[PDB]
Design a protein around this nucleic acid. Structure first.
Length: 581
DNA sequence: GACCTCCCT
DNA sequence: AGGGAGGTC
């Protein structure tokens, strides 16, 4: 039942500082920013050691071992440790293997988020799930030293044992370089971006809040004035009663528990009553208020007026990053009212500016490359407007004859083609029939027979191999590709179509980040990566570096990989993120 | 805490 | 196609 052998050290010794080791720097708080490090474990050829962080991190030897690149560490989720240590003024170097990132690449669907889950992949179970040790939610606590220490040593021991088999399988999948040269170096770069953070103009945000608060009072009362009664507009029950009982509005869609009040459904009810337009407007504002003024203000650090996101680099099934606390990959841009929120994200130093660079149509360009569709590749070699070109082709008209509605619909098809494309899926999106939506898809394929071929071929490959891959050898297993349930098989077919596109795009932007970081250092620029939003990079830099960045950044991003079509990068800069358009 | 719309790329 | 993050039992 019990205890693995280890030295509960009272001070740091030399044999703890070997040049190969499994290391655990445990930060139990979910948000690791400026968070406590609760204990340390080291396992190496000389044994297993638990150290107290107050001891270890006050020790010159240990700190210098941490920062020594030639001293190789094996860890789980090294970025967590790295950041927590940065907030304490200590550099972590020499991380040559990260089990979290290794597990993520081997199979992203396992949802590996702790050492235990990773260990299980190789029939190793001599370690506990963090959830069992720390608890979950309100009962979540750091346990007493003997339980804590044994757990960190078991995790370190698991890392030590598991490196070789993980690396072995990564190599067999041709994923070794993907780990060592892309994801691991990216992890350090993300660490720097998170630590640096983004400066927020809180005063600006707060006055926006106030404008909104007063706009919401007005609409809220107008809504009660129109419903002839007061009610909870946010309630699914109360509103559905006002809409579909008291006002007799027609029921166009019924959800699981009742009537749908989604924006798509409401937009269609607006002609019937003046209440509907005010409810939409109320929700748009309420969204900005709750999610983007209030939400953001509670995560700004009052000391520096910065937000420090955490990028989850081991979550998405596609190889994309996610962003949390705050999520800075969903800041409004589409609607001008919401876009103004970006005026609150400002450079962290005076006389600095925000620089934003974004790939133009990277997904469709990746598709052109992997499908080798002659027409699509030509379209991009001509740097055509792709939605216009797709319109001309599916409706068989000249540039002159393409109407704005034709272009809107071709665009929707382009998106749908990217996401796997179903007559029913597009039909819903375009507010039209499943037949006829099928006519569009069919028509598209007549113009892009290479894309059609790719779609068919990749689904067959998914079935044959059990998975699909990206440009840089990221893998996604698709076991549902064989189910006899149409809906479940279909979704897996869509993932088979989409994942090489979206995943290859993720691959390219990650390499660009790595390449950009190396060029920034080589050039001695003070410019720093602040954020990544799937197909764009956001930096801040002195005004005096703008001109050099205008050349340097797009170029690095464009040259990250060489495809059969060119990659294209647009860029802008300004006093705020908003103005960097 | 666990089941059930709207913002982004 | 991927994500993150108020009412209600």
């Amino acid at each position: 039942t019990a205890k693995m052998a280890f030295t509960l050290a009272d001070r740091v010794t030399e044999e703890m500082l070997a040049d190969k080791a499994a290391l655990v720097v445990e930060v139990v708080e979910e948000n690791y920013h400026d968070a406590p490090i609760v204990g340390i474990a080291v396992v190496n050829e000389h044994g297993r050691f638990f150290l107290r962080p107050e001891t270890a991190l006050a020790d010159p030897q240990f700190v210098a071992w941490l920062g020594d690149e030639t001293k190789k560490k094996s860890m789980f989720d090294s970025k967590r440790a790295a950041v927590a240590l940065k907030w304490k003024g200590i550099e972590l170097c020499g991380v040559s293997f990260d089990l979290l990132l290794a597990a993520y690449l081997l199979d992203p669907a396992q949802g590996v988020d702790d050492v235990a889950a990773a260990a299980k992949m190789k029939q190793y179970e001599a370690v506990r799930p963090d959830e069992a040790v720390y608890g979950k939610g309100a009962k979540r606590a750091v346990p007493d030293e003997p339980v804590l220490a044994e757990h960190l040593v078991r995790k370190a021991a698991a890392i030590w044992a598991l490196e070789r088999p993980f690396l072995d399988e990564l190599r067999r999948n041709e994923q070794d370089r993907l780990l060592v040269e892309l994801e691991q170096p990216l992890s350090s770069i993300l660490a720097e971006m998170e630590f640096a953070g983004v400066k927020v103009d809180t005063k600006r945000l707060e006055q926006m809040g106030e404008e909104l608060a007063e706009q919401l009072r007005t609409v809220e009362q107008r809504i009660y004035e129109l419903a002839g009664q007061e009610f909870n507009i946010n309630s699914p029950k109360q509103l559905g009663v006002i809409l579909f009982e008291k006002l007799q509005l027609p029921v166009l869609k019924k959800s699981k528990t009742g009537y749908s009040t989604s924006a798509d459904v409401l937009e269609k009810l607006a002609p019937y009553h003046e209440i509907v337009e005010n409810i939409l407007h109320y929700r748009q504002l309420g969204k900005l208020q709750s999610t983007y003024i209030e939400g953001l203000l509670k995560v700004v650090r009052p000391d520096t007026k910065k937000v420090h996101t955490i990028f989850n680099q081991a979550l998405t099934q596609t190889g994309r990053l996610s962003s949390t606390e705050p999520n800075l990959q969903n800041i409004p841009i589409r609607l001008e009212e919401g876009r103004k929120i970006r005026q609150a994200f400002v450079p962290s130093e005076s006389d600095w500016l925000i620089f934003a660079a974004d790939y133009s149509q990277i997904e469709l360009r990746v598709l052109a490359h992997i499908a080798e569709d002659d027409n699509l590749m030509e379209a991009f070699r001509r740097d055509l407007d792709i939605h216009t070109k797709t319109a001309m082709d599916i409706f068989q008209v000249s540039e002159d004859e393409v109407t704005p509605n034709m272009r809107r619909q071709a665009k929707a098809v382009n998106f749908g083609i990217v996401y796997g494309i179903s007559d029913y899926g597009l039909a819903q999106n375009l507010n039209i029939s499943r037949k006829e939506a099928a006519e569009f898809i069919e028509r598209y394929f007549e113009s892009f027979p290479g894309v059609k071929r790719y779609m068919e071929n990749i689904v067959q490959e998914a079935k044959q191999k059990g998975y699909v891959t990206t440009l840089l050898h990221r893998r996604r297993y698709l076991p549902d590709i064989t189910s006899r349930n149409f809906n479940v098989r279909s979704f897996a077919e869509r993932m088979a179509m989409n994942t090489p596109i979206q995943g290859s795009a993720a691959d390219i932007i990650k390499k660009a980040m790595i390449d950009l970081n190396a060029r920034l250092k080589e050039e001695r620029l003070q410019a720093r990566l602040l954020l990544q939003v799937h197909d764009e990079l956001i930096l801040e830099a002195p005004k005096e570096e703008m001109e050099r960045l205008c050349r340097l950044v797009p170029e690095v991003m464009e040259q990250a990989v060489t495809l059969r079509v060119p990659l294209k990068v647009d860029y802008h800069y300004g006093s705020t993120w908003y103005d960097a358009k």
